[PDB]
Amino acid sequence: SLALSLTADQMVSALLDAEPPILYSEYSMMGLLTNLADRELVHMINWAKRVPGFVDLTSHDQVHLLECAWLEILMIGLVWRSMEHPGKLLFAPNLLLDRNQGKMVEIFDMLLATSSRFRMMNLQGEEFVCLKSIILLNSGVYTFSTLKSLEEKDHIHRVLDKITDTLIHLMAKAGLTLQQQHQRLAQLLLILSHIRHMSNKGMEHLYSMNVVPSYDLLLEMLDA
Amino acid sequence: SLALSLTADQMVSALLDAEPPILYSEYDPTRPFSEASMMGLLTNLADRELVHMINWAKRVPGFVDLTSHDQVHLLECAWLEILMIGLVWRSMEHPGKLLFAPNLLLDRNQGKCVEGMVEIFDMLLATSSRFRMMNLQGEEFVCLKSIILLNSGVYTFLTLKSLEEKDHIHRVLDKITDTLIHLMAKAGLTLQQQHQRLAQLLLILSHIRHMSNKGMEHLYSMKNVVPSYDLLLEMLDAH
Numbered sequence: 001s002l003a004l005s006l007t008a009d010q011m012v013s014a015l016l017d018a019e020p021p022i023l024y025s026e027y028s029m030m031g032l033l034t035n036l037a038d039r040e041l042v043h044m045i046n047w048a049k050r051v052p053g054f055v056d057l058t059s060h061d062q063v064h065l066l067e068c069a070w071l072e073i074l075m076i077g078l079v080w081r082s083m084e085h086p087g088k089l090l091f092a093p094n095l096l097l098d099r100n101q102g103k104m105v106e107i108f109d110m111l112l113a114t115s116s117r118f119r120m121m122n123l124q125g126e127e128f129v130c131l132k133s134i135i136l137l138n139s140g141v142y143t144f145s146t147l148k149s150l151e152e153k154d155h156i157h158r159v160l161d162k163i164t165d166t167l168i169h170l171m172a173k174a175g176l177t178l179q180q181q182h183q184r185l186a187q188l189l190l191i192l193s194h195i196r197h198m199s200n201k202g203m204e205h206l207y208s209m210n211v212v213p214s215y216d217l218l219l220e221m222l223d224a
Numbered sequence: 225s226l227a228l229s230l231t232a233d234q235m236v237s238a239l240l241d242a243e244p245p246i247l248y249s250e251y252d253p254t255r256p257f258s259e260a261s262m263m264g265l266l267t268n269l270a271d272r273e274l275v276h277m278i279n280w281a282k283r284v285p286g287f288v289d290l291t292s293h294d295q296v297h298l299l300e301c302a303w304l305e306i307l308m309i310g311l312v313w314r315s316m317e318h319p320g321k322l323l324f325a326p327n328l329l330l331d332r333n334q335g336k337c338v339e340g341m342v343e344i345f346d347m348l349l350a351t352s353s354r355f356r357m358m359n360l361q362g363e364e365f366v367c368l369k370s371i372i373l374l375n376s377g378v379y380t381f382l383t384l385k386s387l388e389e390k391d392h393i394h395r396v397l398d399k400i401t402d403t404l405i406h407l408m409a410k411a412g413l414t415l416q417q418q419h420q421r422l423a424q425l426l427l428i429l430s431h432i433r434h435m436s437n438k439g440m441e442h443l444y445s446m447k448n449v450v451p452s453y454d455l456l457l458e459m460l461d462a463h
């Protein structure tokens with residue numbers, strides 16, 4: 001597998017060069033966020049096709065992973081943009097909202113606590129792209145009966161190992177001791193639990209409040 | 225604060241001794257089940273397990289350093305995930321089956337007489353397949369279940385006292401990471417393997433969190449089953 005022969009720095013370079021652009025709101029917030037997320041989705045697809053190992057998977061498996069990950073990925077992008085703005089969520093450069101204005105207030109607070117935790121930890125951009133790759137490959141991997149699917153799962157897990165190794169390398173380069181490398185790895189992956197939880201809450205708050213991209217839509221966008 | 229002084233070997237031992245008992249389900253169930261009666265057995269088992277889960281939590285190194293309010297907050301956020309990982313562990317040796325209790329072993333086809341539950345089944349069965357394929361060790365299971373207790377609710381805290389406890393929580397989590405790695409090293413794993421397995425284990429926790437969210441919808445919708453703040457409170461003060 002082409003993904004599996006990459007070094008850490010080559011993996012990090014691939015992800016960095018695949019990063020989607022920071023988009024702008026075009027001006028009711030729900031409409032502004034819906035429009036913004038819809039335009040963000042088109043870039044997420046094309047970024048995902050550039051995650052090493054992702055296009056080795058079958059188209060069906062690619063859609064399943066994107067189905068499961070799409071909101072976690074939008075959310076981690078949001079908390080990364082809002083990192084250097086304590087107390088505010090940087091939805092877009094022209095749409096920077098705070099708690100009162102933001103609210104739906106429960107979701108808002110959890111996002112602010114995620115951003116603050118990333119500020120606390122001095123999360124680096126090279127680490128962020130790795131984390132967002134892990135979300136793409138991990139979130140749907142436990143919910144795919146055949147020998148093809150067994151291979152696909154095995155492939156995903158070996159690419160996930162390659163990203164783990166990449167993360168460890170980045171920390172070792174920054175001088176962290178081995179004890180500090182394992183600890184910080186754990187800290188990063190434990191926040192991914194919180195993101196899933198925020199994604200699930202956002203989903204159910206969407207229901208109580210169509211806008212979720214369908215399996216067929218994702219497959220159309222992936223295949224075109 | 226004795227908690228952060230422990231070595232890895234004494235962390236394992238502390239958690240192993242803290243493991244709660246395996247309870248039996250209600251012995252006289254009419255079968256086949258209906259939706260109602262199955263829920264009745266499961267709710268009843270979960271309500272009895274919850275009592276023992278409190279006693280275990282108070283023996284997790286560092287848990288009782290927290291204020292009582294924050295102990296409850298952590299149990300509120302984690303209680304279903306902990307019931308689930310325990311269920312997943314019990315069922316490792318039973319492919320295609322969930323061992324709720326030694327006398328309540330259920331297949332996938334039984335889960336569907338509860339309306340929405342078969343999907344959760346499907347997900348809990350796959351976690352037990354995963355754990356079996358990684359040959360998840362008991363000592364690793366007790367570390368993971370402790371991480372859930374302290375992690376699931378930490379991101380929703382906090383002011384100085386709050387920042388102190390969140391830092392105390394993360395320093396215990398760091399100490400359970402150190403422990404997991406120590407286990408992997410003595411089992412002989414290369415460092416590369418030690419890190420890859422740690423990651424593998426911690427990413428499964430995100431799935432467990434999904435399943436809990438899934439399940440919790442159901443309990444609230446489609447609520448009195450969920451243990452209240454007062455109920456947890458007070459089980460905690462019964463010291």
Ligand SMILES: COc1ccc2c(c1)CCCN2S(=O)(=O)[C@@H]1C[C@@H]2O[C@H]1C(c1ccc(O)cc1)=C2c1ccc(O)cc1
Nearest residue numbers: 266267270273307308311335338341344439440442443449
């Ligand atoms: C085959 O019928 C099912 C199966 C799953 C579900 C339902 C029916 C109803 C809809 C919700 N789900 S569920 O996912 O939320 C939850 C996880 C597990 O099953 C449920 C359950 C439980 C049931 C009643 C409660 O009062 C408390 C918890 C579970 C449990 C109980 C004890 C354990 O020691 C470990 C896990």
